[PDB]
Amino acid sequence: QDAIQIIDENKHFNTGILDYINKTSPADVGNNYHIISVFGSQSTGKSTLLNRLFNTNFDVMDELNRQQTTKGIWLAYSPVVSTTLGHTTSKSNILVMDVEGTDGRERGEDQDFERKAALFALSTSEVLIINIWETQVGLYQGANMGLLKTVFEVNLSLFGKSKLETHNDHKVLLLIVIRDHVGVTPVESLAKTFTLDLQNMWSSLAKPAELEHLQFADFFDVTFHALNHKVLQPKEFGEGINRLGDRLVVSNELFKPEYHHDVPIDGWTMYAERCWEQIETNKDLDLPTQQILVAQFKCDEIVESVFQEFLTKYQHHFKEVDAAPDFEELGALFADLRQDAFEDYDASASRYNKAVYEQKRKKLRWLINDKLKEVFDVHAKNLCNTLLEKFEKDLVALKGKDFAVNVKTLSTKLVEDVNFQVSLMSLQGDLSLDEIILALTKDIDAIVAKQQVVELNSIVNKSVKKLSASLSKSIQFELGDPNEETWDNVLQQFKGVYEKFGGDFGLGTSSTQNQQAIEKFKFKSWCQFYDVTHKLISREKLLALLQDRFDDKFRYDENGLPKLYLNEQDLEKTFAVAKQHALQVLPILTFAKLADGSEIVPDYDIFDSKLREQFLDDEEDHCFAEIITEQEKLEVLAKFKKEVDAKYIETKRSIV
């Protein structure tokens, strides 16, 4: 017949509870019992009253030292209820829970466990006695109104939902008993106060909106019972209790079915543990206490001040973007700014909790790093764009001079360059270079790519100038001796240097495109080839072509000698030599051919402007090798004679 702690100081809900309850009462407890408990400030004579109203045996404080006595929560079976008729047994089994008192000492700061044990009780009991001293009544934290708001609050947030399902719910009785009541002030007056206090507490709690409509009466009954001074009025104490004894068993006005959640005790013993789990570790209840709470707000106050003492002192160094930047001047002046602030902050918050102080210092640190990274980022990008120009120039300055072997060194040295120059400002690596260096590389590789296409096309364009050169030249040089083997010693160079285009670049491959450097090149050659022809040999240069050959015999002789004539027989003999010596190369070059009497074709369908501007036409195809149209063709031999026979009989004047 000793009690047990359902829950011990350090929160362990108890196993043998169900067991225990049954081993006390010889009867079978069914849906036949009540659950009653006590709440209040430490040493208000709670255990005392449970021992005296029911007839339990909890421990009470011996009056030698005013100290905490109940620890955790306890449960006992009431043998009998003290009443005016003396001792009385009851119908139902009355199970009583004695809670450790709220407040004072020992646990003076951390109201963790008092918020919790209170709520357990509030949540598990049909009747809750709120045991206050009459003198605490008009008080706030004296009346405990602060640990109340909360419990009732987390109560509603946590179990308020279970309603509207209609029982036989937890309506619960708030049976608020005033202690050491002298009598001067009528309990009815005390009652009006503490209910108003309870009503007030109610409009105050935070309420999930489904229940924003819910009132305190909906969840809760209140009633009051005053006791006289136990020490100075011992008789009128005992009678006051008795009177309360009668209240709950005799009158039977106190327990009602609304509070009994209506299932057998094993049910309750499980329902408690469930509520206990949900309670023991709640978020809403999980709270650091004041010192901390208040050291948070205090340090946040100091930050905004020290930081606003930082801002407009930076609106001043940096409202103007520095004209003459130095990265040692900057980085150092950064440190200084941030030094100033720390000490000032530290001269105001090294008082408070270290951890909070510390946490709120790092908050300050990074508030200012971020205002410094704006500035640093500006000059970081200015430096880069500048440095990047040089570099681009640098690449251009070198002009095909072993590209990739110069991409390596210069690009390397630039990245290195910034990573040194900037890091002088990174405040100890506080400010990062990672994203800058990254954005550099990207801008680097952007350049080479665009300068690579320029070195790629310059290489082609200057490969088509040591080709239109030795090409358009050995067109003529061979032509001082019209041969079977003209084109034999012409394409055997037109293709002796046509091939050595690829592999010589030195740049960096763009390998498929390194490959496509050629199919512009070869298309271009196959287009200058035709352009040399249609320019080197046309109507005009054609009419001329006669005398070029015509006159190295028609008027010179033997060993480079001007031809000395004899009879009209040595004059009328070296004239028909010319009537063919005017026509004897043309068969080699009427439509330009090879050495095998077959037509020359272009590698591409060209005159078509749909293949044209991939590299920058009549009926059949204004033929490729058609140097001269069939009509301008003999518009040369409509003037073969006009001037050549103007020289045979027209210079027959001499022999005269």
What lies within 8 Å, CB to CB, of 362 at 6+ separation is none
Among 48, 136, 155, 426, binds ligand GNP (CB under 6 A): 48
Q: Output the smallest distance, CB 306 to ligand GNP, in A.
A: 40
Name which position in 23, 105, 354, 534 contacts its own copies (CB under 8 A).
105
Nearest-angstrom CA–CA distance, 581 and 481: 12
Shortest CB 101 distance to its own copies, Å: 9
Q: Does 116 bind ligand GNP (CB under 6 A)?
A: no
The answer to whether residue 352 forms part of the interface with its own copies (CB under 8 A) is: yes
Whichever of 182 and 438 has its CB closer to ligand GNP, that residue is 182
403-407: long-range contacts (C-beta < 8 A, 24 or more apart)? 403/452, 403/455, 403/505, 403/506, 403/507, 403/508, 404/506, 404/507, 404/508, 407/448, 407/508
Q: How far apart are CA 5 and CA 41, in angstroms?
A: 19
CA distance 418 to 385: 11
Map the footprint of its own copies across residues 253-312, applying CB under 8 A.
283, 287-288, 290-291, 293-294, 296-297, 301
Q: Which is nearer to ligand GNP, 231 or 634 (CB)?
A: 231
CB of 4 to ligand GNP, least distance (A): 16
Backbone angles phi, psi at 467, to 5 degrees: -120, -40
CA angle 515, 520, 526 (to 5 degrees): 125
Coil vs helix vs strand at 492: helix
* Residue 305 annotated as lining a ligand binding site: no
- Residue 47 assigned ligand-binding role: yes
Is 101 an interacting residue with respect to ligand GNP (CB under 6 A)? yes
When the beta carbons of 82 and 353 are compared against Mg ion, the nearer one is: 82
Taking CB under 8 A as the rule, which mask of x and - marks residues 153-182 in contact with its own copies? ---------------------------x-x
By a kind-dependent CB cut-off of 5 to 8 A, residue 525 interacts, out of Mg ion, ligand GNP, its own copies, none, with: none
Tell whether 238 is in a known binding site.
no
Q: Where are the alpha helices (DSSP H) in 249-353?
A: 265-280, 291-311, 327-349
The residue among 47 and 93 lying less far from ligand GNP, judged by its C-beta, is: 47
Q: Which C-beta is closer to its own copies: that of 254 or that of 460? A: 460
HEC readout, 393-425: HHHHHHCCCCHHHHHHHHHHHHHHHHHHHCCCC
Distance, CA of 137 to CA of 194 (rounded, Å)? 7
Query: Which tokens sit at 71?
Result: 């620890």
Is 204:156 a contact under the CB 8 Å cutoff? no
Q: Does residue 319 bind its own copies (CB under 8 A)?
A: no
State which of residues 25, 69, 193, 528 lies at the interface with ligand GNP (CB under 6 A): 69
Nearer CB in complex with Mg ion: 61/332: 61
With CB under 5 to 8 Å by kind, the binding choice for 457 among its own copies, ligand GNP, Mg ion, none is none
Q: Is 313 annotated as a binding residue?
A: no
291-311 and 354-398 helices, crossing angle to 10°: 40
Q: Is 179 left (phi over 0), alpha (psi -120 to 50) or beta?
A: beta
Q: Which listed residue (10, 15, 166, 189) binds its own copies by CB under 8 A? A: 189
Q: Is 40 annotated as a binding residue?
A: yes
Our finding on whether 199 is near its own copies (CB under 8 A) is no
Q: Near its own copies by CB under 8 A, which window of 231-239, 254-262, 508-516, 522-530?
A: 231-239
HEC secondary structure over 84-107 = CCEEECCCCEEEEEEECCECCCCC
Contact by Cβ (8 Å): 226, 140: no
Which strand (E) or helix (H) includes residue 224?
strand 220-226
Q: Looking at residues 65 to 94 of the shown chain, list those that interact with Mg ion (rule: CB under 5 A).
A: 69-70
Residues 6+ apart with CB under 8 A from 118: 39, 99, 102, 147, 151
User: Is 107 one of the binding residues for ligand GNP (CB under 6 A)?
Assistant: no
Establish how many alpha carbons lie within 13 A of residue 608's alpha carbon, considering only the half-sphere containing its beta carbon.
11
Give the nearer residue to its own copies in terms of CB position, either 184 or 323: 184
Sign of the four-CA dihedral 247, 251, 254, 257:
positive
User: What DSSP letter does each residue of 21-32 carry, written as one string?
Assistant: HHHH-SSPPSS-
Cβ pair 224, 143 in contact under 8 A: no
- Identified binder of its own copies from the candidate list 24, 37, 41, 452, rule CB under 8 A: 41
Nearer to its own copies, 104 or 482 (CB): 104
Separation of alpha carbons 319 and 585, rounded Å: 84
**Helix, coil or strand: residue 41:** strand
Q: Is 136 annotated as a binding residue?
A: no
Q: Which of 5, 42, 47, 426 binds Mg ion (CB under 5 A)?
A: 47
Return the residue of 44, 56, 144, 426 that touches ligand GNP, per CB under 6 A: 44
Is 41 annotated as a binding-site member?
Answer: yes
What does the binding site for its own copies look like in residue numbers (CB under 8 A)?
41-44, 63-68, 103-105, 108, 133, 135-143, 145-146, 180, 182, 184-185, 189-190, 193, 197, 200, 204, 206-209, 229, 231-233, 283, 287-288, 290-291, 293-294, 296-297, 301, 350-352, 385, 446, 562, 564, 651, 653-654
| Residues making up the binding site | 40-47
| Residues making up the binding site for GTP | 40-47
What does the binding site for ligand GNP look like in residue numbers (CB under 6 A)?
42-48, 60-61, 63, 68-70, 100-101, 179-180, 182, 227, 229-231
What does the binding site for Mg ion look like in residue numbers (CB under 5 A)?
46-47, 69-70
